Design an enzyme around this catalytic site. Sequence first.
Site, PDB file in Angstrom:
ATOM      1  N   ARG A   1       0.860  -1.183   0.000  1.00 39.64           N
ATOM      2  CA  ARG A   1       0.000   0.000   0.000  1.00 39.64           C
ATOM      3  C   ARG A   1       0.900   1.237   0.000  1.00 39.64           C
ATOM      4  O   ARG A   1       0.902   2.024   0.952  1.00 39.64           O
ATOM      5  CB  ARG A   1      -0.888   0.008   1.247  1.00 39.64           C
ATOM      6  CG  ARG A   1      -1.875  -1.159   1.328  1.00 39.64           C
ATOM      7  CD  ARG A   1      -2.679  -1.103   2.619  1.00 39.64           C
ATOM      8  NE  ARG A   1      -1.798  -1.138   3.783  1.00 39.64           N
ATOM      9  CZ  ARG A   1      -1.185  -2.233   4.225  1.00 39.64           C
ATOM     10  NH1 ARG A   1      -1.385  -3.400   3.625  1.00 39.64           N
ATOM     11  NH2 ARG A   1      -0.388  -2.166   5.283  1.00 39.64           N
TER      12      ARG A   1
ATOM     13  N   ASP B   1       2.875  -7.894   7.313  1.00 41.50           N
ATOM     14  CA  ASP B   1       1.717  -7.270   6.688  1.00 41.50           C
ATOM     15  C   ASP B   1       0.581  -8.178   6.237  1.00 41.50           C
ATOM     16  O   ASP B   1      -0.063  -7.898   5.228  1.00 41.50           O
ATOM     17  CB  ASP B   1       2.176  -6.427   5.497  1.00 41.50           C
ATOM     18  CG  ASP B   1       1.170  -5.355   5.121  1.00 41.50           C
ATOM     19  OD1 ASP B   1       0.931  -5.156   3.913  1.00 41.50           O
ATOM     20  OD2 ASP B   1       0.626  -4.706   6.038  1.00 41.50           O
ATOM     21  N   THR B   2       0.332  -9.263   6.962  1.00 38.91           N
ATOM     22  CA  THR B   2      -0.769 -10.146   6.599  1.00 38.91           C
ATOM     23  C   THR B   2      -1.747 -10.263   7.766  1.00 38.91           C
ATOM     24  O   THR B   2      -2.792  -9.611   7.771  1.00 38.91           O
ATOM     25  CB  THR B   2      -0.271 -11.561   6.186  1.00 38.91           C
ATOM     26  OG1 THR B   2       0.521 -12.129   7.237  1.00 38.91           O
ATOM     27  CG2 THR B   2       0.565 -11.477   4.918  1.00 38.91           C
TER      28      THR B   2
ATOM     29  N   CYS C   1      -0.764 -20.456   0.376  1.00 33.91           N
ATOM     30  CA  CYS C   1      -0.109 -19.968   1.586  1.00 33.91           C
ATOM     31  C   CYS C   1       0.489 -21.048   2.480  1.00 33.91           C
ATOM     32  O   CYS C   1      -0.183 -22.008   2.848  1.00 33.91           O
ATOM     33  CB  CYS C   1      -1.090 -19.132   2.409  1.00 33.91           C
ATOM     34  SG  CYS C   1      -0.397 -18.505   3.945  1.00 33.91           S
ATOM     35  N   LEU C   2       1.757 -20.867   2.834  1.00 30.60           N
ATOM     36  CA  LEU C   2       2.465 -21.802   3.705  1.00 30.60           C
ATOM     37  C   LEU C   2       2.314 -21.434   5.175  1.00 30.60           C
ATOM     38  O   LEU C   2       2.511 -22.269   6.053  1.00 30.60           O
ATOM     39  CB  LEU C   2       3.952 -21.826   3.350  1.00 30.60           C
ATOM     40  CG  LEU C   2       4.294 -22.437   1.996  1.00 30.60           C
ATOM     41  CD1 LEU C   2       5.774 -22.224   1.694  1.00 30.60           C
ATOM     42  CD2 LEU C   2       3.946 -23.923   2.016  1.00 30.60           C
ATOM     43  N   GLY C   3       1.961 -20.184   5.452  1.00 33.98           N
ATOM     44  CA  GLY C   3       1.822 -19.775   6.840  1.00 33.98           C
ATOM     45  C   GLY C   3       0.398 -19.736   7.361  1.00 33.98           C
ATOM     46  O   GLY C   3       0.149 -19.191   8.433  1.00 33.98           O
TER      47      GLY C   3
HETATM   48  C1  HEM Z   1      -4.198 -13.703   7.113  1.00 34.96           C
HETATM   49  C2  HEM Z   1      -2.899 -14.092   6.795  1.00 34.96           C
HETATM   50  C3  HEM Z   1      -2.392 -14.478   5.536  1.00 34.96           C
HETATM   51  C4  HEM Z   1      -2.975 -14.435   4.277  1.00 34.96           C
HETATM   52  C5  HEM Z   1      -4.386 -13.985   3.893  1.00 34.96           C
HETATM   53  C6  HEM Z   1      -1.992 -14.932   3.348  1.00 34.96           C
HETATM   54  C7  HEM Z   1      -2.189 -15.064   1.969  1.00 34.96           C
HETATM   55  C8  HEM Z   1      -1.298 -15.670   1.061  1.00 34.96           C
HETATM   56  C9  HEM Z   1      -1.542 -15.800  -0.370  1.00 34.96           C
HETATM   57  C10 HEM Z   1      -2.811 -15.343  -1.086  1.00 34.96           C
HETATM   58  C11 HEM Z   1      -0.468 -16.433  -0.935  1.00 34.96           C
HETATM   59  C12 HEM Z   1      -0.231 -16.770  -2.421  1.00 34.96           C
HETATM   60  C13 HEM Z   1      -0.009 -15.531  -3.296  1.00 34.96           C
HETATM   61  C14 HEM Z   1       0.224 -15.871  -4.761  1.00 34.96           C
HETATM   62  O1  HEM Z   1      -0.335 -16.880  -5.236  1.00 34.96           O
HETATM   63  O2  HEM Z   1       0.956 -15.120  -5.448  1.00 34.96           O
HETATM   64  C15 HEM Z   1       0.434 -16.702   0.187  1.00 34.96           C
HETATM   65  C16 HEM Z   1       1.719 -17.199   0.032  1.00 34.96           C
HETATM   66  C17 HEM Z   1       2.639 -17.379   1.065  1.00 34.96           C
HETATM   67  N1  HEM Z   1       2.387 -17.117   2.410  1.00 34.96           N
HETATM   68 FE1  HEM Z   1       0.661 -16.449   3.237  1.00 34.96          FE
HETATM   69  N2  HEM Z   1      -0.825 -15.336   4.005  1.00 34.96           N
HETATM   70  C18 HEM Z   1      -1.048 -15.012   5.323  1.00 34.96           C
HETATM   71  C19 HEM Z   1      -0.108 -15.213   6.341  1.00 34.96           C
HETATM   72  C20 HEM Z   1       1.151 -15.780   6.195  1.00 34.96           C
HETATM   73  C21 HEM Z   1       2.122 -15.866   7.257  1.00 34.96           C
HETATM   74  C22 HEM Z   1       1.871 -15.449   8.710  1.00 34.96           C
HETATM   75  C23 HEM Z   1       3.223 -16.481   6.739  1.00 34.96           C
HETATM   76  C24 HEM Z   1       4.426 -16.770   7.403  1.00 34.96           C
HETATM   77  C25 HEM Z   1       5.035 -15.930   8.327  1.00 34.96           C
HETATM   78  C26 HEM Z   1       2.913 -16.784   5.343  1.00 34.96           C
HETATM   79  C27 HEM Z   1       3.806 -17.315   4.416  1.00 34.96           C
HETATM   80  C28 HEM Z   1       3.581 -17.438   3.044  1.00 34.96           C
HETATM   81  C29 HEM Z   1       4.566 -17.911   2.092  1.00 34.96           C
HETATM   82  C30 HEM Z   1       6.006 -18.319   2.398  1.00 34.96           C
HETATM   83  C31 HEM Z   1       3.983 -17.889   0.863  1.00 34.96           C
HETATM   84  C32 HEM Z   1       4.598 -18.225  -0.500  1.00 34.96           C
HETATM   85  C33 HEM Z   1       4.297 -19.633  -1.009  1.00 34.96           C
HETATM   86  C34 HEM Z   1       4.770 -19.854  -2.438  1.00 34.96           C
HETATM   87  O3  HEM Z   1       5.005 -18.855  -3.159  1.00 34.96           O
HETATM   88  O4  HEM Z   1       4.897 -21.028  -2.844  1.00 34.96           O
HETATM   89  N3  HEM Z   1       1.644 -16.322   5.025  1.00 34.96           N
HETATM   90  N4  HEM Z   1      -0.102 -16.252   1.391  1.00 34.96           N
HETATM   91  C1  LIG Z   2       0.278 -11.491  -2.008  1.00 35.83           C
HETATM   92  C2  LIG Z   2       0.946 -11.909  -0.669  1.00 35.83           C
HETATM   93  C3  LIG Z   2      -0.144 -11.850   0.440  1.00 35.83           C
HETATM   94  C4  LIG Z   2       1.706 -13.270  -0.711  1.00 35.83           C
HETATM   95  C5  LIG Z   2       2.331 -13.377   0.749  1.00 35.83           C
HETATM   96  C6  LIG Z   2       2.722 -11.867   1.039  1.00 35.83           C
HETATM   97  C7  LIG Z   2       2.253 -11.125  -0.319  1.00 35.83           C
HETATM   98  C8  LIG Z   2       2.084  -9.607  -0.153  1.00 35.83           C
HETATM   99  C9  LIG Z   2       3.308 -11.562  -1.379  1.00 35.83           C
HETATM  100  O1  LIG Z   2       4.193 -10.902  -1.863  1.00 35.83           O
HETATM  101  C10 LIG Z   2       2.947 -13.036  -1.663  1.00 35.83           C
END
Ligand code: HEM
Ligand SMILES: CC1(C)[C@@H]2CC[C@@]1(C)C(=O)C2
Length: 405
Positions: free
Chosen positions: A177, A242-243, A348-350
């Site tokens: 943002r 930022d999630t 999402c992995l987290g």
């Molecule tokens: C409400 C919380 C969260 C939401 C809504 C969210 C959402 C997402 C989304 C939509 C993607 C895929 C984006 C794409 O396809 O380009 C993603 C990827 C990922 N998220 Fe989350 N996320 C959240 C929290 C977290 C947290 C807390 C972690 C770890 C600290 C995490 C780690 C990751 C990682 C490592 C990926 C990349 C996976 C890949 O590219 O193969 N996420 N997340």
């Molecule tokens: C679109 C996302 C939510 C996903 C995890 C953090 C984010 C901002 C990325 O750059 C990949």
Amino acid sequence: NLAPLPPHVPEHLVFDFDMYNPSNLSAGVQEAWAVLQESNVPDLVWTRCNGGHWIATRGQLIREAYEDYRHFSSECPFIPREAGEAYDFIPTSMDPPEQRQFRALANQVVGMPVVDKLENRIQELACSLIESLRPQGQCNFTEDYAEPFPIRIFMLLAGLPEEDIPHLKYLTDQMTRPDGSMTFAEAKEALYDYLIPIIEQRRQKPGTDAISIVANGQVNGRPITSDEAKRMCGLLLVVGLDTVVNFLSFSMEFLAKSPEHRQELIERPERIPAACEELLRRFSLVADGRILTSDYEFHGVQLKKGDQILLPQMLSGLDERENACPMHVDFSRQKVSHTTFGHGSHLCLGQHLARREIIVTLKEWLTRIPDFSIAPGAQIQHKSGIVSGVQALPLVWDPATTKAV
Ligand code: HEM
Ligand SMILES: CC1(C)[C@@H]2CC[C@@]1(C)C(=O)C2
Ligand SMILES: [K+]
């Protein structure tokens, strides 16, 4: 500003939606994006805003595009184009097959097994933060809880000092943002300027923190490179800062405005997990996309190689075609469908850590502060972008109605 319409884009598909400042933002950010799902709006539209790009508006197309990485590449996942081009985080900027090897290592530092090891710490921090606020009878939720809870836990696992939060948080926010002071590229280089020396420092003297694990990790049997580690840790910082931080504020804003739902969870705590899922659907907040690897006809629309297409993870669950009366929150909803955590190879992995933080927050907050409301005369402002959020959330309550324990 509107970019000139490309020769292959028909005028009847033009819908000038601005993902960084949507027209109806005042009605709520999810509501602002939902305008893309009004009766007269096509399934796939083109906006001349932010350089020009496609927008899939229905869950069916969003899911389909996320599954087809051969036509929809993650190489340039952000709008505007300059941001997507500079975006090089791992594994998000890669497509299968190359993407998978890095995903395995990432899951290693943020996966369920890691959550288990943080369980006590997560529980303890939530209770400590809430107990400290309880007697005040008021708080600025975004800075007093939404930010410190998820962020301090992340800095703990990443082995980074809490005094570095302000700077890192600012940088991450410019990538999702932007306020205009920094381009995505500038924010990225600042983030890497911070990380590079830490990575080398931890490759020389390995710790047990997430950065050390990534830095000294292996990618399918071979040593990860310093730059690969840097690109991976960059993603970790963005996602840790930022999630969940933003989602917690959307959820609490809703609970502060609906005593009925607060009561439902207080009387039936076993419904918290289900409530968490329904809130994840209703207050979904992510929207990134892909780039066309070649000319391709998709759902009757001619897409050109290089065209950018926004695939709002937020919209799938708000699509009435996936969930009836989508804007209504019902914790007893039968089949909660959504793509809040993404879809396809980049799922999402987290999400396990995210759900844990959300559930712990719901349980521990309602246990100590069952009755609360938005501060007098406060008008909650939302912000839109790759990840949407809440500007501020002032809350108030009568200490006499709280329970310390
Ligand atoms: C409400 C919380 C969260 C939401 C809504 C969210 C959402 C997402 C989304 C939509 C993607 C895929 C984006 C794409 O396809 O380009 C993603 C990827 C990922 N998220 Fe989350 N996320 C959240 C929290 C977290 C947290 C807390 C972690 C770890 C600290 C995490 C780690 C990751 C990682 C490592 C990926 C990349 C996976 C890949 O590219 O193969 N996420 N997340
Ligand atoms: C679109 C996302 C939510 C996903 C995890 C953090 C984010 C901002 C990325 O750059 C990949
Ligand atoms: K790129």
